[PDB]
DNA sequence: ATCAGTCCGACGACGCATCTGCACTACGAGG
DNA sequence: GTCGGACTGAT
DNA sequence: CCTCGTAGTGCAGATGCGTC
């Protein structure tokens, strides 16, 4: 309301001049110190540059290269093909556009019959301006969408008339990370480090980050701790190192380590509370309206309650057992046409971890736990396949199991890492798993 | 005068430069004391497209000398697709921008003046393949486009064996088989036998051939001989001529 | 309060000419005429629409009355009706408006009420050197033939005849000369040459067929202007601006 | 088997307008009645397609246990192929699909037989405590005139009652359907609800060429009824159920 | 003077979505 | 993914 | 029966997304 659009250009134009990051986090801390509330998780979504984290499964913007340089065209009141031209000789279509502000502008309509009254911009109206124009589909679409984008383009100053580009194109330069941000409002908020911890709990809970900080701006940083990893809100499959194989695993594990297969396949992550059935991909989108079937075997071959589990999604040959590559189950997962290519397109959710099963917190309990948990909450089947837990002696018995791989295909081994501390955590990458690659 | 050319009927006038469109994306134009000539080949030389107009259709000739236009269909097409009023005034005439189409339509009372760049050039004499085709007959309009539409989607051959003056035709694979018959004017028009033979032609350019036969309402003469080019006459209902000759590609 | 018109039809095109040239706008219901000013946020247009209250069958006003709309919804469902049909609206909260289709069976449609809020546009006191009065319909064959390729029109205000044509790959010049079936009254004023967008002058060409006499009021220092005439000298003003410059 | 139908238009408008719930078919002919009950892929709406022995003036009945399935697309795209209201006729192979229109003139198709089964009909036999009676042009009309809103349908009904009623957040959709309206007559019932997807119902619309008239059973929480009645005696049914 | 982890964005080549234009087309609207 | 490829400490 | 025209309707022709 009283806001402006000023101030976050000028702090983002005091933003790409440092490269020490112990130095712009302050600036970031003394920056979200000084904004404002009621606006705050707006500001954020702005920051890393989405309108709304897609684990709500809304349908993508479609602005892309050549609408935004037909609608720049339009707003400038000057030829398109000459901004085409200009975009193929500089890379950076914000400068391409930086210049056409200022030495020349557009006249309109609106000001000939006179009327004075405008003023600077504000980032509340802009984004609500920006979340009408995200989806409006309609029939009549392109026309409407670009003569709006085009006019808000126009409503601007030529300083600030380059991140907005970028704002549409889908990064932002500056960069500026998730993880410096989060230890940004811990420093600012916490005062003290010790407040980090905490907010790396509160993302590993969610995969939302505005609810979080609208939370921490509301009250403070307690009343976080005993948040229950819910269903809902994904949580994303944590991360590893790539490595070779040498004789390092055994020596690092200590002792008798659990001996796993490397798949492939997009991952799965599903929340179900006993009702409805929310699936997010590896990354955090639903993938439900392009995998119908998948939200069925759930159902059946788990017995419980609300149930968070951790899968993959690879194709499976119809004639006998034998793996099919990624490129071909590629094509399966565009269509809305299921029913004739989904049956002759067989994958199974193969389970290697049970996360949140009991109602209350899960995650903070070693490798052995959640192992013999998946053993038992199973339905006899070749539809779905487990862990292939098979333990081994040595190397030559270790290097026996990659050569029965080979001969039967796939990417090969991966093991994980077993211990007291050693649990499945999200964030970071880790000695917890270990992937191995060759050539 | 150099150029001096009007035509009574716009559509025919388009129908005409659409039929000629549909095989390339030049044009054509020769004009001598005959009228006004033209000719179109494909490449790999399958079908034929040919202009001919009788000079009683012109309203008005007038020529210095006998010339052709180095005539483009690029984008004259789209702007002359707003042509209208049935039979509405279309004329050409020479200026050095290079070519000046003159439509008026009295349905509203516009004027269309367009302009074009294409230079001048040389005539070629008359350019027709001579050889007796024994089976010929006019037919309807709306049986060829039928064919078409119902032989593409069984395969790409198109044989034809009129045998004991029968027709029978049967194209397509062994399984989708394709069994249609054209009896003495039952749904023809006029029909003669002289030969008993089978065709064997290619049924992509028939579709191709048969698409420049909307708006020609005047029922086209056909003829063909034994694995021979095929033959295929149309009369403008305005004027002018335009055949056909499917170029056979032997016993493959 | 309640309206029917007895037509639907020509609530097709004020709907068409409204849908995407702005997204929204306000139906200024008065107790003399139906107020509907529709600004666009591109600024690059301006339509306004005003109709006398007495197309519908004898319908009166009792109040200011703002019904919100979604353009596309609002159109969405108004395509019903092919055959001579009649609708009829009415409310009683200013929250919740009623929308019912009649003829066939009786289809009635409660619609939200959403907010827009925009400024007043200050009226228009802008004289122009062109007043033709060439066919309607015509208007049709000669901007389909001639923005078809290009992406910009040009108009030159000449003597006795209206000049609309485009250069650049060619020059399609088409004109509305007074003897043949062209203009019907046209005051000359001053030679006058202009320039408009190619597609604010395409949208604006499917709500024709309701009058048969346009009056384009343009010239140089100018910028585009025309209105039909509807039924009780109807008055839609439509607006635009030049191109380039 | 020899078929000679004297609609080529309306029988191919049905099986086209059926070839857009199933993938595969099966024709079963008998003495009296060649059926088509079909299982849906979702396993959401089953249908069934039954046929007289009148439907097809000149027809032939060659054995009674004729038993022939096809592909979906080739027979629709074929038949999409069809002229006017030409006295097309049909005969049956043991091996394959033979097709021969008989217009203006003679024509002819030719396709294969495609070894399939799987007779999985779900036997209804419900309660279902509504039944009315409407014409096919008013519920064709009505059906498509509100479709393009979203997905939400609920078919609410009142003592002899029918009602259609689609609700969205932004508006809403009310259909008065009495019998002093537009809804014929034979209405008998009771206050009960339920709801259907959008399209799934949308799409069965297409049922306006082989058409007298239309029922209508349904319930709460119980599989719709729609039966699509025929001329002489034929009936095609589409058994959706609620959501 | 040298090592071990460790964060962070370009890489463009795209299969298929999804709108857009845009020729046909059966059916309704009047002589 | 993905491989760099820059960025933070330590003996 | 003879003309439109008109909203559909299918078919190419673009641009852009999420996945490495
Ligand atoms: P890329 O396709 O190599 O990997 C995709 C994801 O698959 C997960 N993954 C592969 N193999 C395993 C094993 N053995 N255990 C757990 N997760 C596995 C990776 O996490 C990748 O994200
Ligand atoms: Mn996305
Ligand atoms: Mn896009
Ligand atoms: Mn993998
Ligand atoms: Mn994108």
Redesign the pocket.
């Known amino acids: 309301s009283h806001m402006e659009f000023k101030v976050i250009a000028e702090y983002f134009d005091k933003l790409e001049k440092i490269?020490?990051?112990?130095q712009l986090t302050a600036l970031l801390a003394d920056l979200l110190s000084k904004s404002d509330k009621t606006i705050i998780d707006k500001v954020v979504y702005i920051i890393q540059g989405k309108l709304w984290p897609?684990f709500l499964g809304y349908?993508?913007?479609?602005?892309?290269?050549?609408?935004?340089?037909k609608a720049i065209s339009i707003a400038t009141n000057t030829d398109e093909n000459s901004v085409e031209n200009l975009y193929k000789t500089i890379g950076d279509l914000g400068e391409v556009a930086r210049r056409l502000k200022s030495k020349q502008q557009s006249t309109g309509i609106l000001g000939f019959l006179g009327t004075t009254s405008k003023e600077s911009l504000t980032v509340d109206e802009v984004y609500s301006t920006l979340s009408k124009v995200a989806l409006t589909?309609?029939?009549?679409?392109?026309?409407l969408k670009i003569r709006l984008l085009a006019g808000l383009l126009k409503k601007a100053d030529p300083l600030e008339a380059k991140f907005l580009v970028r704002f549409?194109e889908?990064?932002?330069?500056?960069?500026?990370?998730?993880?410096?941000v989060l230890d940004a409002m811990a420093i600012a908020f916490g005062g003290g480090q010790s407040a980090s911890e905490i907010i790396e709990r509160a993302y590993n809970l969610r995969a939302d980050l505005g609810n979080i900080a609208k939370i921490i701006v509301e009250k403070g940083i307690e009343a976080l701790k005993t948040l229950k990893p819910q269903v809902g809100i994904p949580i994303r499959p944590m991360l590893a190192?790539?490595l070779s194989n040498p004789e390092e695993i055994l020596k690092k594990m200590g002792g008798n380590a659990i001996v796993d297969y490397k798949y492939?396949g997009?991952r799965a992550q599903i929340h179900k509370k006993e009702d409805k059935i929310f699936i997010f991909?590896?990354?955090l989108?639903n993938?439900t309206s392009q995998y119908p079937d998948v939200v069925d075997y759930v159902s059946k071959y788990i017995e419980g309650k609300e149930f968070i589990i951790e899968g993959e999604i690879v194709a499976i040959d119809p004639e006998s057992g034998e793996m099919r590559p990624?490129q071909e189950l590629?094509?399966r997962?565009?269509?809305?046409?299921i029913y004739e290519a989904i049956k002759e397109y067989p994958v199974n959710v193969f389970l290697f971890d049970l996360m949140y099963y009991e109602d209350v917190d899960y995650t903070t309990k070693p490798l052995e736990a959640r192992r013999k948990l998946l053993e038992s909450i199973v339905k006899p089947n070749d539809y779905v396949k487990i862990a292939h837990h098979i333990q081994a002696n040595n190397v030559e018995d270790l290097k026996s199991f990659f050569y029965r791989a080979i001969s039967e295909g796939g990417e090969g081994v991966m093991v994980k890492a077993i211990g007291k501390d050693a649990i499945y955590q999200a964030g970071?990458?880790?000695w917890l798993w270990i992937?191995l690659?060759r050539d | 005068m150099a150029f001096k050319i009007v035509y009574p009927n716009a559509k025919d006038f388009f129908s005409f430069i659409?039929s000629i469109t549909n095989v390339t994306d030049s044009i054509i134009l020769n004009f001598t004391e005959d009228g006004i000539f033209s000719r179109h080949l494909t490449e790999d030389k399958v079908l034929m497209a040919i202009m001919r107009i009788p000079k009683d259709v012109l309203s008005e000739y007038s020529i210095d000398s006998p010339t052709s236009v180095k005539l483009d269909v690029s984008s004259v097409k789209?702007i002359l697709?707003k042509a209208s009023s049935?039979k509405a005034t279309i004329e050409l005439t020479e200026t050095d921008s290079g070519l000046k189409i003159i439509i008026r339509d009295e349905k509203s009372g516009a004027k269309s003046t367009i302009y074009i760049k294409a230079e001048k050039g040389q005539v070629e004499q008359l350019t027709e393949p001579k050889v007796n085709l024994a089976v010929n007959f006019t037919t309807d309009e709306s049986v060829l486009?039928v064919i078409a539409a119902d032989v593409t989607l069984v395969g790409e051959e198109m044989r034809i064996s009129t045998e004991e003056d029968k027709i029978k035709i049967e194209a397509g694979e062994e399984g989708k088989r394709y069994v249609a018959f054209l009896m003495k004017d039952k749904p023809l028009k006029e029909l003669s036998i002289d030969t008993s033979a089978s065709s064997s032609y290619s049924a992509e350019m028939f579709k191709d051939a048969v698409?420049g036969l909307?708006g020609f309402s005047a029922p086209t003469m056909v003829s063909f001989g034994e694995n021979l080019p095929m033959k295929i006459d149309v009369e403008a209902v305005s004027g002018g001529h335009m055949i056909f000759w499917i170029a056979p590609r032997l016993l493959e | 309060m309640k309206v029917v018109y007895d037509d639907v039809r020509v609530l097709?095109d004020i709907i068409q000419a409204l849908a995407r040239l702005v997204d929204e706008a306000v139906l200024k219901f008065k107790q003399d005429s139906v107020e509907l000013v529709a600004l666009d946020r591109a600024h690059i247009s301006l339509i306004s629409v005003n109709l006398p209250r007495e197309m519908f069958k004898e319908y009166d006003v009792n109040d200011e009355f703002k019904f919100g709309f979604n353009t596309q919804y609002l159109m969405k469902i108004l395509?019903v009706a092919?055959?001579?049909e009649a609708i009829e609206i009415a409310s009683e909260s200013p929250d919740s408006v009623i929308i019912n289709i009649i003829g066939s069976t009786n289809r009635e449609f409660n619609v939200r009420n959403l907010e827009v809020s925009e400024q007043e546009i200050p009226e228009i006191n802008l004289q122009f050197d062109i007043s033709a009065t060439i066919s309607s319909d015509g208007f049709k064959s000669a901007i389909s033939e001639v923005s078809?390729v290009t992406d910009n029109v040009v108009v030159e205000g000449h003597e006795d005849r209206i000049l609309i044509k485009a250069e650049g790959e060619s020059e399609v010049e088409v004109e509305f000369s007074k003897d043949t079936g062209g203009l019907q009254d046209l005051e000359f004023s001053k030679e006058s040459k202009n320039s408009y967008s190619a597609?604010y002058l395409?949208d604006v060409l499917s709500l024709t067929?309701l009058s048969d006499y346009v009056k384009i009021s343009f010239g140089n220092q100018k910028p585009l202007q025309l209105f039909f005439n509807m039924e009780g000298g109807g008055k839609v003003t439509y607006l635009l601006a030049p191109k380039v410059l | 088997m020899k078929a000679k139908v004297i609609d080529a238009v309306s029988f191919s408008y049905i099986l086209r307008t059926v070839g857009d719930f199933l993938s595969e078919a099966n024709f079963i002919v008998t003495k009296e009645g060649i059926r088509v009950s079909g299982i849906d892929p979702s396993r959401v709406v089953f249908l069934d397609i039954f046929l007289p022995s009148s439907y097809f003036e000149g027809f032939e009945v060659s054995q009674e246990k004729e038993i022939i399935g096809f592909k979906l697309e080739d027979v629709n795209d074929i038949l999409k192929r069809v002229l006017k209201d030409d006295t097309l006729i049909l005969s049956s192979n043991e091996s394959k699909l033979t097709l021969t229109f008989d217009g203006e003139f003679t024509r002819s198709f030719e396709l294969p037989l495609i070894q399939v089964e799987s007779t999985q009909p779900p036997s209804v036999n419900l309660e279902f405590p509504f039944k009315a009676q409407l014409l096919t042009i008013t519920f064709a009309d009505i059906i498509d005139e509100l479709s393009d809103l979203g997905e939400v349908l609920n078919i609410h009904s009142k003592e002899n009652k029918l009602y259609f009623e689609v609700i969205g957040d932004l508006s809403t959709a009310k259909v008065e359907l009495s019998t002093d309206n537009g809804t014929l007559l034979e209405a008998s019932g009771a206050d009960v609800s339920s709801s259907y997807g959008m399209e799934y119902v949308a799409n069965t619309t297409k049922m306006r060429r082989a058409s007298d008239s239309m029922e209508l059973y349904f319930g709460s929480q119980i599989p719709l009824k729609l039966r699509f009645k025929l001329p002489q005696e034929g009936y095609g049914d589409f058994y959706i159920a609620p959501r």
Not at chain 1, 137 to 143: F, H, I, L, V
Not at chain 1, 170 to 180: E, H, K, N, S
Not at chain 1, 333 to 337: E, F, L, P, V
């Open positions: 490269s020490s990051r112990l897609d349908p993508e913007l479609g602005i892309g290269e050549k609408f935004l340089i589909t309609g029939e009549g679409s392109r026309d549409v889908g990064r932002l330069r500056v960069g500026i990370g998730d993880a410096t190192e790539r492939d997009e991909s590896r990354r989108e993938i990624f590629m094509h997962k565009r269509k809305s046409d970071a990458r880790g992937k690659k | 659409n789209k697709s049935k486009n698409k909307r | 097709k395509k092919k055959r001579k078809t597609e395409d067929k």
